[PDB]
Design a protein around this nucleic acid. Sequence first.
DNA 1: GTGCATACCGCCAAGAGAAAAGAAAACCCA
RNA 2: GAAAAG
DNA 3: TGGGTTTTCTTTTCTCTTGGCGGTATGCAC
Lengths: 309, 997
Amino acid sequence: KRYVTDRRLAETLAQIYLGKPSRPPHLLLECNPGPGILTQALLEAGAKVVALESDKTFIPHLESLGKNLDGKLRVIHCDFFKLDPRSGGVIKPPAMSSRGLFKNLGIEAVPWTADIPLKVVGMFPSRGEKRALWKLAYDLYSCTSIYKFGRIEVNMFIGEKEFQKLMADPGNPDLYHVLSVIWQLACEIKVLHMEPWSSFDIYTLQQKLYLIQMIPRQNLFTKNLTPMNYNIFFHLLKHCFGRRSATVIDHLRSLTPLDARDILMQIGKQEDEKVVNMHPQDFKTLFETIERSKDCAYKWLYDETLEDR
Amino acid sequence: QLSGQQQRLLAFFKCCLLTDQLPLAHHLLVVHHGQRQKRKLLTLDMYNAVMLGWARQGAFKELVYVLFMVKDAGLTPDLLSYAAALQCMGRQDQDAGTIERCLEQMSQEGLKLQALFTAVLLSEEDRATVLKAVHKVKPTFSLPPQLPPPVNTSKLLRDVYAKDGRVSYPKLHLPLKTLQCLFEKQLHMELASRVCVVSVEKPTLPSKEVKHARKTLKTLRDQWEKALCRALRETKNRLEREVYEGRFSLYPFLCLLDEREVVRMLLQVLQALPAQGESFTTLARELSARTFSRHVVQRQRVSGQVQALQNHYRKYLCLLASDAEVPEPCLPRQYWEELGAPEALREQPWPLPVQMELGKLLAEMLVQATQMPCSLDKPHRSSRLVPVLYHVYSFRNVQQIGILKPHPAYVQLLEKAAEPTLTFEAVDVPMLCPPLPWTSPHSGAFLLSPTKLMRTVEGATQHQELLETCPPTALHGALDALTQLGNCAWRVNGRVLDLVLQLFQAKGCPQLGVPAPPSEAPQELRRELAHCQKVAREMHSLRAEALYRLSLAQHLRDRVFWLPHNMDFRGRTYPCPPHFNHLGSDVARALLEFAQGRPLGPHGLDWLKIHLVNLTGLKKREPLRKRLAFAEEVMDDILDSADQPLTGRKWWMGAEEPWQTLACCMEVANAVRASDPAAYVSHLPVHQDGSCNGLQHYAALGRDSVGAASVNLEPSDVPQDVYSGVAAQVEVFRRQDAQRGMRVAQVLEGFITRKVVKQTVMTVVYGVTRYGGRLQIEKRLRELSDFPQEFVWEASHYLVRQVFKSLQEMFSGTRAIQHWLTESARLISHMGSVVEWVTPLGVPVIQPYRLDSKVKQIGGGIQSITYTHNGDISRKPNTRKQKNGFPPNFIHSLDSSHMMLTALHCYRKGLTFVSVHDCYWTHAADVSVMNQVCREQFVRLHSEPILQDLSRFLVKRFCSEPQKILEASQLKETLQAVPKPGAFDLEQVKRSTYFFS
DNA sequence: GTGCATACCGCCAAGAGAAAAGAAAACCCA
RNA sequence: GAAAAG
DNA sequence: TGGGTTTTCTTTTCTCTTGGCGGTATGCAC
Ligand SMILES: Nc1ncnc2c1ncn2[C@@H]1O[C@H](COP(=O)(O)OP(=O)(O)OP(=O)(O)O)[C@@H](O)[C@H]1O
Ligand SMILES: [Mg+2]
């Protein structure tokens, strides 16, 4: 399991997470503090740090350093990918609900237009990066789990192979697919550091991990785009990218009874517009122009029965 | 083997002979022959097809040319080529010199004319015209006389097929003329190929909206009919023109049926599409199967075999008729073959890629050809023609499947129109006449429709090869038992049907198994609406299943019907109609009874009472006298349940099988209130069921003394159950863990019963993992309403751990035999060959498990289908699946052997016998005789060294080729390492009261 | 004789859709 | 996503 | 030798991944 254990630029990441000096002591939900050196470097900044850890085997070190810092380090045993578990009743100490976190820390829900209340740092899984992107994206479009509590920024390491797969635009036809459009509409990626594999000593073909700082965008939800009908938009994206060489007309003749030529005339994109050459904002406004059509009643054919057959 | 394109071209030529497009097939022949690089694909059968076709026409001009093509290609003429030449010379009535010269050429060629006549598949008309051709050269040529039909002389099947002894064969209660009329009805039903039934839902009020919806649906259906006619004509002209420029098309495959029939078939499959949609490959399979079935029925109609089958069936019905007496009693198959048997033309099915592209083309034709206005909901606005069906990609993990979902306005018009009829295929409906006797793996259950002897999910499979390369007398017992099970006459219990219709038409009762209508579904906070839609869709699915079942039950309310029966690859018997049968739910078994009844006799009411106590689910551990005394104690409750099913004390609802209990309460109420209880004619089926029947067979092969006592192979005063013993061990472990304060034991308490532990204890003696037992007990804990539903996962793990701890040091011979079977299957499947074995009744059984799933992608207008080429293109056997399949499959094959022996030896005693798996049903009069015959057939089946004969057979077949010996010697160690039997006198099974109970 | 167009096939991909909440054991693969 | 039979 | 994958078997109701690009063989134009 990948764990940060080198003092190289740990103060630099600390100054990254400091932000504005006039800000109050800002909560840092560090995910998997294995060695605890990064947690110590974060505590050197002076702001409050909350540790969320999946490795309970080496648990006493974090709280033992926590009492030395007069309770700044409120260590609570939890794994970040396992908040609000999946069809599970009995809450085990590895996996627990987000309401438990936010009742223990006293911090509460804010409206979506309000300022950022919270910061998360941590790892993606070594292999399950795509799935964990999907967990965070599902929790972001459906404002549940962490993102019910506000516009939660989350800053983490990303793999090189899946980085430009998330930063892709019209262009790069080999690697431009659903997760790029799904994230980039509300994500605000800025690359903070470009560290190679050598410093990342995994605790017991170079891979260069980039810091992507996911921030939800305020202008995500509209009258047409709601946290109710986000699965319809997700199905639009994956159906459109199922046949990459096909055009928007081909996919929307199968997606809606609406004439796709008229919708593309409204959006401003031509009839020969290919899927891989269409902007991620254009997907969203395509969804919004289909959604606001009021003359017809049946606007989409997607339903949860398309989960199987 | 043959290439795919070779198979497709051969199918093209054979279809041209059927469609009379002989000029078109000759065109492809000369096109593929005049140029070189594709001519390397043409084979002998490909030329002989067009040879035989030109023979049937009596055209020398093209036949001499095709013979010249055969000589120029470098391939020698076979038997069928000279048979075609003799056919064409005999048809033209031309002089004896040419036939003399060509038959002299046949004699010079050296191959036998009797070998041209016999053991090579020709039609009887071809045989007759070759006879007419040869009778001018040799008038002294005579075919060999018909040998007498051979008699199976195996030891298990020697009491049957024996001319000595008194046999009282059963006779149906219907007379001859009524049975002939029902044969006419079923013949008309199968010629029509579809059945329309009235729905059991209450009819909607015919308002203006309903009538306008019906008119709109009618004009849309007429427009789709015309559009599909135009699309089919355009496709056939394109295929004909595409053929003319030298390419294999599908053109004869679309002229097999009439245009109206194909359009009507496509409209029928369009009508029966669920709102969620179906897979494109599924529509391809179903459309191809429907087209093939209609091709078979139409070909038998035109060829004149319908009249031959008619004239033979009127003579065959004299054996099974009450008022008609045969000179010598015999079985239905023996009487079918004793008379002049009509020739059954073995029709080779289409190859799998041909079926796939035919169904794919027909599905694409339905999608493109049908157009609808812009929205059926409020269609008054100006309309652009949007498709009726939409091709949406549905996504499950990495997998992407194409689904044809109907448009929601089409769906809304379908439930707004409230169509009062439902349409079934003729295959999916119970037969109105006694089925054709199983005389061959081809000639089978239905009158005209093709039906497989062995059900197979895969398209082309090696099962029929073993069914035809067997000795002719090997399958006689299985076919006769299939005929006997199909000959049972069924009858719908009208009172139970009335009560289930009462509950279904009103708000349903899910406690009694009647689905509630989806309109009565209940309606963080944002998740609740989606959850309600999920619940509503579950009740939408189950009520539609019940809608088919009760409609088909209402269709058969006042008519005697028959359930034809097939097998799977390992021999277990199922009724062919899938909707309404006796292998279904409690309601379906309650609706069914025997159409012929028997007087109860001196001790028949006792069997009814014991059966009723068995259906209550109470007094399961108690002896027969205790069950009879209990039935005497609840006699008033029995009469209250029978007289007042829904307006009384509702005692029958608390039973484990409520509707079956209610039907048996009605039967007991009519039997006791009769003047003479022995003279009451009873039609109710009384069931005898095996207690741990896989374990019964494991103890029978192992000859153990402890497990056999546990599974009631030793006589005892009380029944013995291992499930409750494991449940008691798990419960005392739970009490010890609740003493320590463990939370799961405190949650469980008294919830550990026989039912939650039954399937896992039943299953551990096969190659199960702990994940399978986990899901097995998780489902049983999830169906419990009183259990807290947040604790299902952790209680499932705890309960699996205590169950697998409980079975340690238990059933030693069973685990030894299962380990031997698993080891033998692993060593067989590690090599190329899959596991084969022969049942003691002689049935060959092979497993269709192979690793390779070929993509076989077929380009098309909409998408590329992905189907596994099952016709042995897959090569590497699935070792894990062979291991995990063989120990259950062998035990179920021996189950089938015991069932068939019991059926065949109860037929000679005049007993009506039907069987769910390890559940033998007979009349309440003859339960004791069935029990005695079941025990004797168990003894005779298990007095045979089944493990030892299996080992000798496996060494003889799969361990005798020289090239594998150095790799199979360890297998030779494994196969000859069967466990010893030990000491258990198995004759005591004949005194075991609770063997089947 | 040489280069270009066309058909067929292997492969590894991601929206591997989440559920990676959760168990751990044998069989196969790199 | 479910349900039924052994 | 360490990690991916599926997990007892049928039967049925309502029931198979698709697509895209490169690598190679073969026929055709010059
Ligand atoms: N889920 C299953 N998996 C494998 N085989 C099964 C399964 N259910 C039933 N069988 C087979 O059917 C027979 C058991 O049927 P049945 O339901 O009568 O169980 P049982 O063990 O005899 O219990 P009971 O005494 O309660 O009837 C055995 O031959 C067994 O192999
Ligand atoms: Mg049983």
